[PDB]
């Protein structure tokens, strides 16, 4: 399963 990205840049 692929991660759910909560915040990014």
């Amino acid at each position, epitope marked *: *399963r*692929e*991660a*759910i*990205v*909560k*915040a*990014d*840049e």
Partner: antibody, heavy 119, light 113 residues
Framework: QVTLKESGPGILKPSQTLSLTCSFS??????????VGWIRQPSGKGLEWLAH???????YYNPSLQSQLTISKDTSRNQVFLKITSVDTADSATYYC???????????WGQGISVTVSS | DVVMTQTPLSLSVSLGDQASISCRSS???????????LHWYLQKPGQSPKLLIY???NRFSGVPDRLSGSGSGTDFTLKISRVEAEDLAVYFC?????????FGGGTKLELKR
């Protein structure tokens, strides 16, 4: 100026529940994008991810450990909590809480707390 | 989980030389959103890990441009130019594209003298 510090017992017995607390400063879990993670490292071994909690109450768990793990927070006191039920010697490790960038890369870490599961 | 194969296990280099560390993933680290979630850390004995590089090439604040990351897909490299005594540490990659995040087995960096 982000700092984190783990607290909890240095030793407990197999079958008991491990209760860890992360206390942090330099950021708030009320701020959008913020997250705190727990990661452990048995002596001389590799890191293992445990759980993350986010500013919006979203929580994520290591799928192979989730039946043992509960993460929670007290945003008002800048604390995050981890509970691990039914510990055994395999759970002996240094436990770290960490500030997250948003995608499970941890850019500030606590000093770590050594936890030994033993009779 | 996704396996990070990190090579070499140990590295002993002359002062001022370059050190190069490779990390290969068991599958592509390109997220469906198009970004690549691969990071580099170090850890000195008795100390917590320290973030060096996030998302393949971005240096974390305080990290000298002496250290650089590159790669794509399944193949990634950390390069440390002008190795100095303060660089002594175990270095490791980490993927977080997939759950759970996983970590390279480490490369111990030692220096000649």
């Amino acid at each position: 100026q982000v700092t984190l510090k783990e607290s909890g017992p240095g030793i407990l017995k197999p079958s008991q529940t491990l209760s860890l607390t992360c206390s942090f400063s330099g950021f708030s879990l009320s701020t959008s994008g913020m997250g705190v993670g727990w990661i452990r490292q048995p002596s001389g071994k590799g890191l293992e991810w445990l759980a993350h909690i986010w500013w919006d109450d979203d929580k994520y768990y290591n799928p192979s450990l989730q039946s043992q793990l509960t993460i929670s927070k007290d945003t008002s006191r800048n604390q995050v909590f981890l509970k691990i039920t039914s510990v055994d010697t395999a759970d002996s490790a240094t436990y770290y809480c960490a500030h997250d960038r948003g995608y499970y890369a941890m850019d500030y870490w606590g000093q770590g707390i050594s936890v030994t599961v033993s009779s | 989980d996704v396996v990070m194969t990190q090579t070499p296990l140990s590295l002993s280099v002359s002062l001022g030389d370059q050190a190069s560390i490779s990390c290969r993933s068991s599958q592509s680290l390109v997220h469906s959103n198009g970004n690549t979630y691969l990071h580099w850390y170090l850890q000195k004995p008795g100390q917590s890990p320290k973030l060096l590089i996030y998302k393949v090439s971005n240096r974390f604040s305080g990290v000298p441009d002496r250290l650089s990351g590159s790669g794509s897909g399944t193949d990634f490299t950390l390069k440390i130019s002008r190795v100095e005594a303060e660089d002594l540490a175990v270095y490791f990659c980490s993927q977080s594209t997939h759950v759970p995040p996983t970590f390279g087995g480490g490369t111990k960096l030692e220096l000649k003298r």
